[PDB]
Structures are given as structure tokens and as C-alpha cells.
Amino acid sequence: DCKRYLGLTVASFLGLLVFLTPIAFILLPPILWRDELEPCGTICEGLFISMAFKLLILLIGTWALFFRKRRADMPRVFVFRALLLVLIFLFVVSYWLFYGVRILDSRDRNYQGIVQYAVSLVDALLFIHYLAIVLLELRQLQPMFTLQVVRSTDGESRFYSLGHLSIQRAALVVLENYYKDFTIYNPNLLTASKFRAAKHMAGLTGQSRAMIAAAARRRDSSHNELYYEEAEHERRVKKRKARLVVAVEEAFIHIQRLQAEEQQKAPGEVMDPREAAQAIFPSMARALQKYLRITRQQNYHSMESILQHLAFCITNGMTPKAFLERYLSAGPTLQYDKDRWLSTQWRLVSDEAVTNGLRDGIVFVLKCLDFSLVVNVKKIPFIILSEE
Amino acid sequence: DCKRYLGLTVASFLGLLVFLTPIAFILLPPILWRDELEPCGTICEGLFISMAFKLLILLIGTWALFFRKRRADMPRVFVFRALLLVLIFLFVVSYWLFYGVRILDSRDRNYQGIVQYAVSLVDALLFIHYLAIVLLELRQLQPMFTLQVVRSTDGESRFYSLGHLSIQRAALVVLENYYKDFTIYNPNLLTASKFRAAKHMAGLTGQSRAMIAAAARRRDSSHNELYYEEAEHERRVKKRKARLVVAVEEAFIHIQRLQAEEQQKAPGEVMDPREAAQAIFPSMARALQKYLRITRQQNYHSMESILQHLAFCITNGMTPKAFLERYLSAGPTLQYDKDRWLSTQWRLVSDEAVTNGLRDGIVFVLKCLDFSLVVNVKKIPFIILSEE
Amino acid sequence: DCKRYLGLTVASFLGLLVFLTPIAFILLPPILWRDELEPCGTICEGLFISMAFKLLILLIGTWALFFRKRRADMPRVFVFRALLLVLIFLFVVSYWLFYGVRILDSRDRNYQGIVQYAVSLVDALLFIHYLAIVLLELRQLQPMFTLQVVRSTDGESRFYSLGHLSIQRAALVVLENYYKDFTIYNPNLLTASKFRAAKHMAGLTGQSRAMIAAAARRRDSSHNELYYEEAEHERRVKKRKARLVVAVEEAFIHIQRLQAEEQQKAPGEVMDPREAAQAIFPSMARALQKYLRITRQQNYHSMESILQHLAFCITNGMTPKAFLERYLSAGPTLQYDKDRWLSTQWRLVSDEAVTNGLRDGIVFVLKCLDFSLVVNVKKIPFIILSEE
Numbered sequence A, B, C: 001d002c003k004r005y006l007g008l009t010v011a012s013f014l015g016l017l018v019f020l021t022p023i024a025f026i027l028l029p030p031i032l033w034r035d036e037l038e039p040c041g042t043i044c045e046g047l048f049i050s051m052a053f054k055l056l057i058l059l060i061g062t063w064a065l066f067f068r069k070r071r072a073d074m075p076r077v078f079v080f081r082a083l084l085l086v087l088i089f090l091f092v093v094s095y096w097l098f099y100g101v102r103i104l105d106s107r108d109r110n111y112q113g114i115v116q117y118a119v120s121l122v123d124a125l126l127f128i129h130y131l132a133i134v135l136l137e138l139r140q141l142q143p144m145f146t147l148q149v150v151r152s153t154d155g156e157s158r159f160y161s162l163g164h165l166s167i168q169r170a171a172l173v174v175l176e177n178y179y180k181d182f183t184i185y186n187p188n189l190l191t192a193s194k195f196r197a198a199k200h201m202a203g204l205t206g207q208s209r210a211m212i213a214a215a216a217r218r219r220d221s222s223h224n225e226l227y228y229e230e231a232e233h234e235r236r237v238k239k240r241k242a243r244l245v246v247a248v249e250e251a252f253i254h255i256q257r258l259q260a261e262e263q264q265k266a267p268g269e270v271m272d273p274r275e276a277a278q279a280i281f282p283s284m285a286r287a288l289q290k291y292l293r294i295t296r297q298q299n300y301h302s303m304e305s306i307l308q309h310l311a312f313c314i315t316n317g318m319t320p321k322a323f324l325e326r327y328l329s330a331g332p333t334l335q336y337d338k339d340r341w342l343s344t345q346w347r348l349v350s351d352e353a354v355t356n357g358l359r360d361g362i363v364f365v366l367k368c369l370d371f372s373l374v375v376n377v378k379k380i381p382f383i384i385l386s387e388e
């Protein structure tokens, strides 16, 4: 709690002082001298309301665009943010020094000559705001480069289009798209592949090349063990899927019967779905467990999670197919619980510095626990179009 | 017609008057007094052209961004639009009152002091324009939240990334992505599922739990009726697909033969594809009807629509595979006719008010005739990246 | 090289002169007259720093948004770019003429009256910059229209959402999405289809319609030759895929064994993957060639490309599944070599003028060597949402 307040005060007090700087500039001359005032006329009154409106617009824009919580942590310093911060710092301190030196040191600088200066601040500071969207959001709008992300474990391949962005920013975009695009990582397939491959190790340069070529030729004429076992596994998966579908349909029929029975007990008082899920889960529990075992998905789907999903479906009145399809096949990472995914162990590996922008032919790696994503960057070819 | 003009006049006259307000401000002093003019010099001439250029830029921007037809109707009031409208209203009326009170009430306010005021308007109003993109478009650029949309009927699941948006805006985005992303809703599958489930109803707490567990265990050892009938249906669908492919290939061969025959009749005079479609449709009509019956897609595909698609393919000279794949499997909603989809019966259900912004863990429902879409909102986890 | 420099000088000198125009405007009066200077005071000093900051912001924005290489060539003139260029040209020349006529022709226009003019330029020019994003990027942000792109050869269908854009811009967006979205074009399937269809040609109005209907009815009762041969082809493809998977697993086991053996030879000195790939390729070469022959993918995948991919996987330590899936099925165009795709022969065909904006119901064609993409444009329906 203390750290949050300490971080918030730094960003709040500086913003408050830079926003009230025009107010101080327009309220200091009246309080410094009283009998030396020159006739202001009307230009000051006309400029005051325009300055107030510009300040209100700046406040609204700052709240809309930049009053938000940080989403990700950058391994290195952010070039654009640091540039904007130092630009704002100099923009403020130079004006403060000018006001303190060229104005407060002499009995001069009439009020009518200060208000036009004051509106010169909000006119310029807003321009800095106009720069902020340029470096952050408007720079990446154009689809310049193409990023291909391939997983090292299961080989899932995805394609995205990005603009002129840093390596770290591109990696963060790839990571945020990974959760909602890539299939959940399953180490069971990796363990099965390792078990299959370990048999060759357990069993055990022109001449060596000839010998290995002859061995490969002999293997090509051997029995195709993989195909028949894959077909049998697919048949078993289909049979268990059909059994699970039938069980879920019967469970939903029982749910409808229970709701109908509870309707007569009390009108206008819907029952809580929790007890219905409690009573209905054992009916399909065996089928669901068998399907998870045959699909190697028991680790991700927990009993409490299944009950919560069933209760959510009961509240929404979803069809049995919607409930079935969640456990049917593996999907996005965000579907499962929060503890399933880790957003802290991610690392970036690249020969080039991450501060540099995207270039054609550069390749980087996003490492994480037991798995890595290789990202290839390519340049969009020069498309030439002609009217026939 | 009258309603359209009435709505257009309100948005046109106000824009015209707010755009011509600087013109009135710079043209009223010359017409009010003539012999009281002060020497303007050159600053007024320099400011006039800058004001004209700023007005031209504002006109171009207003035409580009905001001169467009409304796309969707908001069930509640739009906060950002109302805020912008009231801000513009006060920005105009306060300046009008200031001009009418502090200037027109006395023989003062020399011309050189008014032009600098006039350019203060277009400088500020454009800033309001700069605010309009901030609240409407620039606010949703950052991918803050993730929305998962699941259909209640068939369980189709999709994932999207949105920014800081209202519940109604997120629902509208989900709806507009539904047409081009989700598969067309097919009630035939629902009717088949209901017919299958009705058999159990027609046939008909620890002890009850034990009895239902024993019944489920006995059912698990029963015959798997679903798998074999699904396999037979898939085989029939594949056979009818092959027959339809052969029929379409023969029809395209006949189309090519007819075109070749018509070539000799008259050079440079291509035949209208309508009669070719008329003559060719009966050849593949039986196969197409059988495929639609076996795929439960006869309702969506009409005979006139099939003829129009065939004529379009003849004009474009598409391969038979392109024609086949449209009727092969169900696709997006926008493929079929306009009357197929309804954009009026949509409703929004959410415990929280739709005016509030997106928050983690909130869930809402988009209802429509016989089907609902459940949308879950999640927050992107804090991704921490480190350089190894 | 000469052409690049000639093109760069035109865009560089004009930018330099328009950026230094305020500097010339503020530095010419001091060098023209010396003894006629009026007391400047302090407003000039306050405006100078604001002008410098605005110039710096303009330079940063110009570098960020517009200092980039051209991506595509427009067959016709670009309306927005031409409008911006002519607007800038007039904005510069009119001010230059005004400065040369109304200032340099008389011993007038005191310095204090010029600086406020000078800041009037950077205030307006930046606004022109604010217009540039409006016409180019901010105009297409709103998802107005939907574009459906269907290939003429294989019938691949994709859907995209675009804004208020010209026909040329929409075609360019479709083309840039085609590489990363559509499957690579394979003429082998077209040749097979043509060979299958040529048999009917080689073998060879109410009465004609009856005869063709009877022929179609007789054909519907004939043998389904396509289904059985497709099933046999699928079985052969699956068997060869399993054999290739086994061969790749054995090759990766050999790679791991070679790496382990080389580890003892020298610590901290990793071997180059080129020789390992050279020694390992013959082991899986026969299986890979057989799979390419059965999948008609031998043309795209070359031996050098396979060796490079194997070396890349060895460097990244990818699983055999990742290596297998690249050659498993045809994917995006960008995966293969640069020479595979052509971005010069693209042509645009449309009855309406390409300079006009997108409208509902308009259809255009993107032609290229042996294949065309038909794009249909539709308007998003008016969605009406109500709170229950």
C-alpha cells in the first residue's frame, strides 16, 4: 500500500504543478505589485477563458489516454517514454527559469504582456500531448513488418502484422497474442514423444552415410506401427466423446427435470445452481474423467472448475454442446485458471539490442518454463499494382 | 424523407453557424462603426489568412471524420458524444455572450484587439476536435481487456481484444464481429438434439445418488449408438459431396462447351450468363438438393440465390471448387441474403449498468431470437519480461 | 543510386526550407535594418523559445510518421497525398508572397509585430500535420464495410473489416493480408482437376434439357469413383506422414547423439549446425521426398531450404514436431522463398473508377499470373440494441 501511494504521489504532484503553472503565472503579478498595474482592457479577459477551456481539454485528454494502470514491465528503458518525460521536464524548467529571471527581477513585464505568454504554454503543451500519441500509438498503425511465431514444443505457427516497433514491444505484442491465439501447452505429448524416442537410444564418413542410408531404407519397408495405433487412439477418443455427449445430455435432462420440479415448490424463487451442480456432477463424472484421461486433459480441468462451469451454464441456460466443447479440445490459455499461466518467467533472447527497431531478417526468442517461441521478422514486399 | 431532412438540418445549421462565427466576429466591427476605426496595420491581414487556413483544415477534418452515416443505435445515452456536444454548446454560447456583452455594449474593443481573439477560437475549437478522436478512437487502441464470446446454441467460441470501452460498445463490437466470424446459426442441429433427448423423457438423497450412479455405470457399458450412426452420416455426406463435385465439374464442362459454341456465332458479343445458368442448373439441381438435404442447408440456399451465384461465377470464370465450397459447409452470416440475419431484436443483459466501463470478471449476455451469446471479460495479466 | 538521391533531394530540400522558414522570418529583419529597430521588450524572447519547441515537436513527428520508405505503388494518383502536398505548397507560397510584398517593400513591420506572425506558422503547419493523420490513418479506424475475398482457383474465402477507403487502398489491404492469410496457390490440384475433366470432353430446347436431366439421373446411380480413390489417397498420405514422423524422430535422435559426442571433444565450442544438417539430411531425405511427392509440395520445398530450416531448428533446439509441421501442410505465402511470390503482376479490375470510395454492392477483381481474387464489398447492417 505504501509503495503504491509513493509511486502515485510522484506522478500526481508533478502533473498538478504543471497544470497549475499557468494559474500561478496569471495570479502572481496581481499579488506581487498592486499600484503598478497597467490597464489590461479586454484581451486578458478573452484569453483567460480560452486558457481555461484549453486546460479542461488537456485534463480530459490526460485522464482518457494516460490515467491508466501499467500493463507490462519493460526489461530495458523505454525510449519514447523517457524522451517524452525529459522533454516535459525541460519544457517546464526552462519556462520556470525564464519567468523567475526575466520577469521577477525587474518592475516590468506588464500584465497584458504575460497573458499572451500564458496561453503560449497550453498551446505548446497540448502539442506535446499530440506528440505522445504519435510516438506510442500512431507509429504502429501502418502494417510494415510481418512476425511469424512458432512454438518450439508443439510447433504451433501464427502470423501477425506489426508496424515500426522495438524488439521488446514486438515481443510483448507476441506474448499478449499468445494467450488468446495459441493452443495451451501440453507436456503430455512431449512425454509421449520422449518415451517413443527413448526406445532407439535404449536399443543402442562415407561408409557411415551408406550404412545409415541402408538402415533408413530398411526401416521404410518395416511395419508402420504409428498409423494403426493412432487410428485406434482416434477411434477410442471418438467413442468416449460420444459416451460423454450422451452422459451430458442425460445430465441436462435431469437438470431440466429438477428445475421443473422446483418450479411448483415456490414461484418466483429460482433455486441456487450450486446444489444442482452438486447433485448432477456424479452422473457425468465417470464419463468426463475417462474423456480427460484419454485426451490427457485431466491436469488442466479441476473438479471445482467443472462445477463452476456447470453452474455458469445453468445460470445462462446453455445447450449441452456448449458445455461439452470447452472440454472437447484444448484451446486458448485464458480459458483455464489464472495459476495455469505464468507471466513472470518470460525472457527475451536476441543478438541485436532490444532497443533497436524491427528490421527484415531479424529473429528472436521468447523463453519460458520448458518452452520457447521463435519469432521471425520479415518485410512486406513492394506490391506494384497496375490498371490492366 | 421529411425525418431525414429534419435530422440533417439540426446538424447542418449549427455546424454552419459555429464555422461562420469567426467570420461574423471579424465582419461585425466594420459594419457597426465606420468613422471610429483605428489603424489596423498588418497583424490583422496576417491573422486573417491563418484563420482562413485553420477554418479550411477544420472543415476538411469534420468532413473526413464526422460527416458519415450512423451505423448502430445505442440503447442508452452515449457519454462521450453527450459530453462533446455539451462542451461545444458551452464553448459557443459563452463566447457569444462575451462578445455581446463586453464588446457590443461600448464604443471600445479596437479591431486589432479582436482579430487575435478570433484566432483564439479556431485554435481552441480544433483542440476540441483533437479531443474527439481521443475519447472515441484513441481510447480503445490499447489492448487492455480480452472478451470471450460463446454461443448458447452451438457453443461456438471466439476471442477478441478490446480497450477501455463501455459495456454497450463492447457488445456492439461483439455483434459486428459475430457476422463475419461466427458460423451461421442452424436450428436443425438443435431440433435433432431435442428429438434425441426427448426419448429419455418419453421413457419415464444418498440413495438417489447411488441409483443414478449405478444407472450411469450401466449406461457406460451399453451400446454406443451415437458413434456408428455418426460414422454412417459422415460416409453418406462424403459420398454425396463427391457426387456433387462430379456433377458441378460436368456442369462447368457444359458451360465451357456452350461458351465455345456461342463464340463462333458472334465475335466480340459475349452471351448473358443468365440463360446459361438457366440451362445448366437442372443438370446439378438433383445433386445440390441431395447435398443440402443431407447437410440441412436447404433453408439458407435458395434457387434464385444459387442461380445468382452461378451467374456471378460465370462472369468471373471461377473454378468449380470455388462454387462448390460456398455450399460445402456453413460459414459466416454475411454470405447469405439480408433477410437471413436480424439486427433489431438484439438485447443486452447485464447486472451492471451499460454506461460503466469494462472491468475484470464482468459477464454479459447478448440476446436474440432463439439464441444468446455469453461474453466474458478478463484482464490481461501483468507480463514481466527480463533479459535472461 | 543516382535515382534514389535525386528522389531524396526533392523531399529533403523542401522540408528543410519549410522548416527553416520561421528562422528566416525572425532573422531577416535584424539583417535588413539595424538603426531602425524598435524596443522588442520580452514578448519576442518568450515567443522564440515556444517557436523552437514547436519546431522540435514538428521535427519529431515528421521523423516518426513520415520518414519511412514507400511500401506499395499506386497505379493512379493518390487523392489524399496530392491534396496534402498542394495544401502545403499553397500554405508556403502564400506566406512567402505576403512576407515579400507587405513587409519587405516598406520601412515598417516592427519586430514585435513579426514574431507573433512567426508563431502563427508553426501553430498552423502542425495543424496540417494533425490533418495528415486524419485523412490517412484516422479515417479507416471505424469498421464501416466488410470485404469478402474469394480465390478463383481453389476457392479460399476470407473476410476482413475496413473503413472508408478507396478501391486501390482496399485492394492493397486485401493483397497484404493475402500473403499472411491465404494458403499458397498450388497448380497441381488445378492440373489434376483439368485431367479429370478432360475425360468427358475426350469421350464426346426442352428435349435437350430432358436428355441432360436423364443423363444426370443415370450418372447419380453410377459408381462413386471419387470417394474410394480419395480415401485411398488419404490413407497413403497418413501412412507416409507417419513414416516421415518416425524418420524425423530418428534423425533428431542422431542429432542429439552427435551433439553429445561433440561435447566431450571440446567444451564451450559448439559445432556449426551446417555439417550436422548435411550429415543428417540423407537419413530422412527419402521419406521427405516421398511425402512431398504424395502431397505435391516438392516444387516449393528445395533441398537448400530444407537444410537451412534444419540448421535453424538445430540452433533453436526445436522439437521434431515443429520441423515436421512446416512441410506437413501448405500454409502462408511468406513461409517460402522470396522468388515464390510475385508482387509486380498484380492488376485491378473494376467497372467503377478506382478513385471512388467503397460502396455497398461493389465488386472488384485482383488479377495475377494464372489466378484472380474476387472481392465483394458489403455494408454492415444497422444494429439496434435495446435494454430488454
Ligand SMILES: CC(C)CCC[C@@H](C)[C@H]1CC[C@H]2[C@@H]3CC=C4C[C@@H](OC(=O)CCC(=O)O)CC[C@]4(C)[C@H]3CC[C@]12C
Binding pocket: A077, A079, A082, A083, A086, A087, A353, A355, A356
Ligand atoms: C532536446 C531533448 C529532446 C533531448 C532528449 C534526450 C534524448 C536525445 C535521449 C534521451 C533518452 C535517450 C535514449 C535512451 C536509451 C537508448 C538506448 C541505447 O541503446 C544502446 O546503447 C544499445 C544499442 C546500440 O548499440 O546502439 C541507444 C540510445 C538510446 C536510444 C538513447 C538515445 C538518446 C535519447 C533518446
Ligand SMILES: CC(C)CCC[C@@H](C)[C@H]1CC[C@H]2[C@@H]3CC=C4C[C@@H](OC(=O)CCC(=O)O)CC[C@]4(C)[C@H]3CC[C@]12C
Binding pocket: A079, A083, A164, A165, A166, A355, A356, A357, A358, C055, C056, C059, C060, C063
Ligand atoms: C535544431 C534542433 C531543433 C535539432 C533537434 C534535433 C532532433 C530532431 C533530434 C536530436 C536527438 C534525436 C533523437 C535521438 C535518439 C533517438 C532514439 C532513437 O531510438 C531508436 O533508434 C529506437 C526506436 C526506433 O526504432 O525508432 C530514435 C530517434 C531518436 C528519438 C532521435 C529523434 C530525433 C532527435 C530528437
Ligand SMILES: CC(C)CCC[C@@H](C)[C@H]1CC[C@H]2[C@@H]3CC=C4C[C@@H](OC(=O)CCC(=O)O)CC[C@]4(C)[C@H]3CC[C@]12C
Binding pocket: B077, B079, B082, B083, B086, B087, B353, B355, B356
Ligand atoms: C464543464 C462541462 C465539461 C460539463 C459537461 C457535463 C458532464 C459532467 C456530464 C454530461 C453528461 C453526463 C453523463 C450522462 C450519463 C451518465 C450515465 C449515468 O449512469 C447511471 O446513472 C447508472 C450507473 C451508475 O449507477 O453510476 C452515470 C453518469 C453519466 C456518465 C453522466 C456523468 C456526467 C456527464 C458526463
Ligand SMILES: CC(C)CCC[C@@H](C)[C@H]1CC[C@H]2[C@@H]3CC=C4C[C@@H](OC(=O)CCC(=O)O)CC[C@]4(C)[C@H]3CC[C@]12C
Binding pocket: A055, A056, A059, A060, A063, B079, B083, B164, B165, B166, B355, B356, B357, B358
Ligand atoms: C478546475 C476545472 C478545470 C475542473 C474540471 C473537472 C473535470 C476534469 C471533470 C469534471 C467532470 C468530469 C467528468 C464527469 C463524468 C464523466 C463520465 C464518466 O463515464 C464513465 O465513468 C464511463 C466511461 C468510462 O468507462 O470511462 C467518465 C469520466 C467523465 C467524462 C468525467 C471526466 C472528468 C471531468 C470532465
Ligand SMILES: CC(C)CCC[C@@H](C)[C@H]1CC[C@H]2[C@@H]3CC=C4C[C@@H](OC(=O)CCC(=O)O)CC[C@]4(C)[C@H]3CC[C@]12C
Binding pocket: C077, C079, C082, C083, C086, C087, C353, C355, C356
Ligand atoms: C484550396 C485547396 C485545398 C485545393 C486543393 C485541390 C483539390 C480541390 C484537388 C487536388 C487533387 C484533386 C483530385 C485529383 C484526382 C481526382 C480523381 C478524379 O477521378 C476521375 O476523374 C474519375 C472518377 C469520376 O468519374 O469522377 C476525380 C477528382 C479527383 C478526386 C480530384 C478532386 C479535386 C482535388 C482533391
Ligand SMILES: CC(C)CCC[C@@H](C)[C@H]1CC[C@H]2[C@@H]3CC=C4C[C@@H](OC(=O)CCC(=O)O)CC[C@]4(C)[C@H]3CC[C@]12C
Binding pocket: B055, B056, B059, B060, B063, C079, C083, C164, C165, C166, C355, C356, C357, C358
Ligand atoms: C470557403 C472555403 C473555406 C470553402 C472550402 C471548400 C472545401 C471544404 C472543399 C473544396 C474542395 C473539396 C475537395 C474536392 C475533392 C475532394 C476529393 C474527394 O475524393 C473522393 O471522392 C475519393 C475519396 C473518398 O472516398 O472520400 C473527396 C473530397 C475532397 C477531398 C473535397 C473535400 C472538401 C473540399 C476541400
